Amino acid sequence: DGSPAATPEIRVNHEPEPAGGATPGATLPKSPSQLRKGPPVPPPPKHTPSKEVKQEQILSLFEDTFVPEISVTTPSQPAEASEVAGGTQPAAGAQEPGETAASEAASSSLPAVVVETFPATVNGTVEGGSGAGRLDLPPGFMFKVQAQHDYTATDTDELQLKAGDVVLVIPFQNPEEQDEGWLMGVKESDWNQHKKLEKCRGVFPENFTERVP
Secondary structure (H helix, E strand, O other): OOOOOOOOOOOOOOOOOOOOOOOOOOOOOOOOOOOOOOOOOOOOOOOOOOOOOOOOOOOOOOOOOOOOOOOOOOOOOOOOOOOOOOOOOOOOOOOOOOOOOOOOOOOOOOOOOOOOOOOOOOOOOOOOOOOOOOOOOOOOOOEEEEEOOOEOOOOOOOOOEOOOOEEEEOOOOOHHHOOOOEEEEEEHHHHHOHHHHHHOOEEEEOOOEEEEO
């Protein structure tokens, strides 16, 4: 008959908000031993003495022969006999024979023996390498030495040696930088790097090495 109407409404809205952060950590660096050194190696008093003595001598020879040995002989002796008798005397007895004999012999030989000997040689192994050494020698250098033991040296300027290695004795940058019983030398291989030997310099125990004349 008479009645209005209506229709209400509604709504809703929103928006979240994220975030973030950081997660720091920590470190614990250490310091390595630079320019490390060790105690010297004192050599023995006596090991084994030696020497060398050579000599010689000359001699002569000689010989000779002469004056032969000859000699002949010719024996001889006749004979004879006779009789007379005067009848009234019969015979019976008679002479007696004799006859002899003899013998001989001989022998000999002559062996032999052979003996030979054949030599033999061979050479020609090297074939490659592929490398190149220095051109000029290191200044101040003294002489070459030879290791007698294998001492692993791991430092910021150490010199590794192997039982039977070659090292050249060179004058370090200073004696104060040298250790007691150790000197500044360079390996033969380093020699090839003479171009930068100053960067190949190292130290090594002389007592643990031997000098090469």
